[PDB]
Amino acid sequence: EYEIIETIGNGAYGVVSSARRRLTGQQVAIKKIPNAFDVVTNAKRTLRELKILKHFKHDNIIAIKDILRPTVPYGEFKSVYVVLDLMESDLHQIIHSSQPLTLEHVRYFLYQLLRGLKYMHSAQVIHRDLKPSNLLVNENCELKIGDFGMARGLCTSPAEHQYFMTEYVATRWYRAPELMLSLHEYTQAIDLWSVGCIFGEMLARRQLFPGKNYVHQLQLIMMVLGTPSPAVIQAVGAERVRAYIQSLPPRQPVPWETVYPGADRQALSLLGRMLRFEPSARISAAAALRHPFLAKYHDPDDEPDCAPPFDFAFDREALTRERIKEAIVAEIEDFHARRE
Ligand SMILES: O=C(Nc1cccnc1)c1cc(C(=O)c2c(F)cccc2Br)c[nH]1
Numbered sequence: 001e002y003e004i005i006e007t008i009g010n011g012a013y014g015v016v017s018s019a020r021r022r023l024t025g026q027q028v029a030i031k032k033i034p035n036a037f038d039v040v041t042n043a044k045r046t047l048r049e050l051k052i053l054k055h056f057k058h059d060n061i062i063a064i065k066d067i068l069r070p071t072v073p074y075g076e077f078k079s080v081y082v083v084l085d086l087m088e089s090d091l092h093q094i095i096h097s098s099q100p101l102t103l104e105h106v107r108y109f110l111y112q113l114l115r116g117l118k119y120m121h122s123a124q125v126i127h128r129d130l131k132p133s134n135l136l137v138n139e140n141c142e143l144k145i146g147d148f149g150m151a152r153g154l155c156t157s158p159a160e161h162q163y164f165m166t167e168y169v170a171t172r173w174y175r176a177p178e179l180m181l182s183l184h185e186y187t188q189a190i191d192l193w194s195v196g197c198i199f200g201e202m203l204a205r206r207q208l209f210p211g212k213n214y215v216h217q218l219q220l221i222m223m224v225l226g227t228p229s230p231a232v233i234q235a236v237g238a239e240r241v242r243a244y245i246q247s248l249p250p251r252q253p254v255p256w257e258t259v260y261p262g263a264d265r266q267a268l269s270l271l272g273r274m275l276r277f278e279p280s281a282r283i284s285a286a287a288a289l290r291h292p293f294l295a296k297y298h299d300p301d302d303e304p305d306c307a308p309p310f311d312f313a314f315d316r317e318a319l320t321r322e323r324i325k326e327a328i329v330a331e332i333e334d335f336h337a338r339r340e
Contacts, residue, residue, distance in 0.1 A: 002030065002083070013149075018086055028065055029087065033080040036328070043324040045149045046080060048315050050331045052125065052148045055310050060116030062087070062136065062146040067332045080328065087136035087144060091198070095132055095205055103264055106202040109135075111297040112143035113195060117285035120145070121188040123306035127151050128179075129170040130194035132201060153312040154187065166237075172217055173197065173207055177228070177277050180218065182237030189279035192288070196274030203260050203267060215244065226253035228277045266293040 002019045008029075009016030015032045037043050053064045066083030070076075091109065094101060113135060120127065129150035136144045150170050156163055166179040166186070176193035178185050200208035209224075211217025218241075222228070227250055228236075236242040256268040270293045273283035283291070289298055319327065 002028070004030070013147075019083075027086045029084040031082045031084060033082070035078055036080045037078065037321050037325040040319075040321055040324065043321055043328070044315065044319070047324055047328050047331065048151070048312075049148045050082075050328065051314065052151055052310065054331070054335065055123065056120065056306065058116060058119045058304070058306070059142065060112045060144055061120065062144045064335070067335050069332055069336065070329070074329070077325075077329070080332075085136075085138070085144060087138045087146075089137045091132035091135035091137060091143070091202075093133075094137060095202055101202065101205060103267065106199070106267065107293065107296065108141070109137075109143055109202060110195075110199055111289070111294050113145070113198070114285050114288050114294065115303055116143070116145045117188075117191055117195070118289060119304055119306050121191070121285050122309075124153050124188075124309040125151055126153070126186070126188050126190050127194075128190055129174075130191055130198065131171050131174045132198055135198070152186075153310065155312070156186075157316040159316070159318060167214065172214075173210055175217070176279070177221065177232075178279050180214075180221075181228075181232070181235070181241060183232065183235045183279070184237075185235075185279045187279055188284070189282045192274050192282045192285065195285075195288075196271055199267075199271055199274065200260070203263055203271075218245070222248070222251060224254050224259055225275065225277060226251045232277050264293070266291070269293065 001022060003022050005018040005020060005027075007015060007017045009031070013031065014034055017030045017032075019028050019030045020026065021028060033046055036046055050064070050067070053062065057063070063085055064082060065085065068081035068083070094105075113130075117127075125148075127145065127148065127150070129147060130145070134145065134147040136146050138144075162169055166182050167175075169175065169179045174194040174197045176190040177183065179190060197208050209217060209220040211220045222245075227248065228245060233242060233245055236245065256272055257263070260268060260271075270283070270288060270291045273288070273291070276282050288294070289303055314327070
């Protein structure tokens with residue numbers, strides 16, 4: 001059914017190769033999840049990604065084009081092959097390169113990211129790990145959100161270490177204050193902080209808050225945003241963090257005009273609405289699409305929502321490796337049953 005072109009990716013997630021469907025000639029990406037059922041955590045992540053990707057049908061979200069069925073007896077089925085959209089590059093590679101990246105690239109890239117998030121957020125899915133390298137870009141300039149391994153809903157299981165250890169959730173440089181500080185307000189606003197960091201990074205072609213560790217990350221955010229308000233400080237989970245913030249002299253926010261000199265006024269207005277300490281003070285993905293900065297591309301009638309919401313109940317279940325394997329195999333079966 002597929003002719004392998006060349007092996008591209010490795011590792012942690014598995015091996016990624018480019019390929020073509022022999023009959024149609026259609027170019028695809030094939031990801032091999034080797035020994036997919038050996039580790040609970042990894043198997044749970046595979047299951048979660050398969051369901052999330054099967055749930056969405058959106059141009060700015062990576063899609064499963066095919067899932068290869070077992071070709072061996074059930075007991076011998078050990079590695080999963082997922083056929084995905086072939087995406088040549090990513091936003092990290094574009095930002096950090098000799099390629100052009102004008103205000104017009106920023107505007108179009110931001111538009112697509114926000115269009116994809118509006119859809120995902122309406123399904124009650126918080127990606128929690130947005131960063132330029134997870135924003136894949138093809139040769140036609142289509143941006144797609146990938147890597148849904150860290151994604152969660154509005155309600156998560158207390159059985160997971162992350163439930164309590166929010167400061168290890170995702171990547172330090174794009175991690176929302178609520179996760180860093182355990183503010184007990186974990187909504188789609190987590191993603192809008194990440195968007196602001198990505199937006200800033202596209203404007204200057206360098207990371208906005210590249211903290212060397214936990215404290216340095218907090219320092220970096222406060223050097224621009226100013227000291228958090230007492231309402232935020234009181235909500236800080238840990239006393240050592242709370243005490244550390246209070247041990248520092250008062251700081252007023254620095255205008256985005258100083259951080260990004262001579263940058264577009266409408267780009268800084270939108271950036272300001274995204275990068276706020278308080279999750280509820282942040283602009284939503286839907287309201288950001290209505291901002292004058294994205295007026296050129298914005299069509300309310302071409303920016304869909306996702307109905308019905310995605311349910312994370314399956315992920316909260318304590319399953320053994322074998323029970324997760326059965327669930328994954330049932331997902332591959334459902335994929336083919338829905339197609340036929
Ligand atoms: O085509 C892809 N990768 C490529 C790169 C470079 C050259 N050729 C091909 C591709 C990757 C994907 C993904 O969802 C993906 C992944 F498999 C592994 C890690 C992150 C992510 Br996000 C879809 N498509």
